[PDB]
Ligand binder design. Structure first.
Ligand code: HEM
Ligand code: HEM
Lengths: 145, 145
C-alpha cells in the first residue's frame, strides 16, 4: 500500500519537492513553527492532540512547541533525503507512522497538514504546483495510517 | 540538570562534534545500522526494548531496523544543528527524551550507546578525543531522562 502511494512520486514531483525544500528546510525552527501555528489556527480541533505542549498560543516562545516543531522538520528532511530509493522511503515512513498510529491519528486527520504546508510554501512564493507535490508526499504517509 | 549539562559543551567540544559528524553523518543508513548492531552485540540485554523490530540479527535486511537506524541518525543531525543555540538544543533534547522516558529508558541505560559510538568513531579514524566529545553530548540527554 505504501509502496503503491510512493509510485505517485514521479521524477517531476521529486524535483519540485527537493527544490522547495531547499528553501523551506533552510529555516527549520522558523518554518516548523509557522506550520504548527497555522495548523492550530486553521483547524483548532487538532490542538486536542497537543495538551503536553501547554500554551500553544505563545508560538515560538513556547519551548515545548518550538522543540516539537524543529523535530517535525527533521522528519521531512529524512523523507526528502530518501526520495531516490523507494525501499528506504517506505521503511522510514512506516517507522514514522508507528507513533502516530498509537496516538490514534487517522489518515484524514493527518491530511489536515496540507493546508498549512500550502500556505507556508506560498509565503515563500511556491505556488500550487509545489503544493500538489507535497500533497503527494503526505499521501505516502497517509497510506501507512 | 539539562541546562547545566548543556553548558558543558565548550567551544572545542562543539568543534570536534562537527568535524566527526561531517564524516559519520555522511552515511546515515550505514553508520546508523552499524551503531545499532554494535549496541545489540555489546549489550544483549537491551534487545528486549526493541521487540517490535523483530529479528535484529538480520541487520540491514531488517526493514524495521533499517528504518529505526536512519531515524536515529536524524536525531543526532538535529542535535548537531542546534549546537549554536543552547536554548534550542535544550528544547530539542527534552522533546526527544519524552518518548524514551515513556519506555522507561534510564540515563544509565541510554549511556550504553557510548560504547557503540566510540567503536564506530574509531572505525573512521576518530579516537578518544572524539568519543569523549560525544559522551558529553550524550550526557545532555542523560540529564533529561
Ligand atoms: C508532515 C506532518 C507531520 C510530521 C512531519 C510530523 C512529525 C512528528 C515528529 C517527528 C514527532 C516526534 C516523534 C514522535 O513522537 O512520533 C511527532 C509527534 C507528534 N505528532 Fe506528528 N507530524 C506531522 C503531523 C501531525 C499531525 C497532523 C498531528 C495531529 C493531528 C500530529 C500529532 C503528533 C503528536 C500528538 C505528537 C506528539 C507531540 C508531543 O507531545 O510532543 N502529527 N510528529
Ligand atoms: C544516540 C542515541 C539514541 C538516539 C539518537 C535515539 C533515537 C531514537 C529515535 C529518533 C527514535 C524514534 C522516535 C521515537 O519513537 O522516540 C527512537 C526510538 C526508540 N529508542 Fe532511542 N535513541 C538512542 C538510544 C536509545 C537507547 C540506548 C535505547 C535503549 C537501550 C533506546 C530505545 C528506543 C526504543 C525502544 C525505541 C522504539 C523502537 C521502535 O519500536 O521502533 N534508544 N530512538
Amino acid at each position: 500500500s505504501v509502496y503503491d502511494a510512493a509510485a505517485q512520486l514521479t521524477a517531476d514531483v521529486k524535483k519540485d519537492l527537493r527544490d522547495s525544500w531547499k528553501v523551506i528546510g533552510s529555516d527549520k525552527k522558523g518554518n516548523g513553527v509557522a506550520l504548527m501555528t497555522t495548523l492550530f489556527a486553521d483547524n483548532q480541533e487538532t490542538i486536542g492532540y497537543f495538551k503536553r505542549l501547554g500554551d500553544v498560543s505563545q508560538g515560538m516562545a513556547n519551548d515545548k512547541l518550538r522543540g516539537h516543531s524543529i523535530a517535525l522538520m527533521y522528519a521531512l528532511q529524512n523523507f526528502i533525503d530518501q526520495l531516490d530509493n523507494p525501499d528506504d522511503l517506505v521503511c522510514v515512513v512506516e517507522k514514522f507512522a508507528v507513533n502516530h498510529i498509537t496516538r490514534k491519528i487517522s489518515a484524514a486527520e493527518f491530511g489536515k497538514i496540507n493546508g498549512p504546508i500550502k500556505k507556508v510554501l506560498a509565503s515563500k512564493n511556491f505556488g500550487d504546483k509545489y503544493a500538489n507535490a507535497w500533497a503527494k508526499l503526505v499521501a505516502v504517509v497517509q497510506a501507512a495510517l
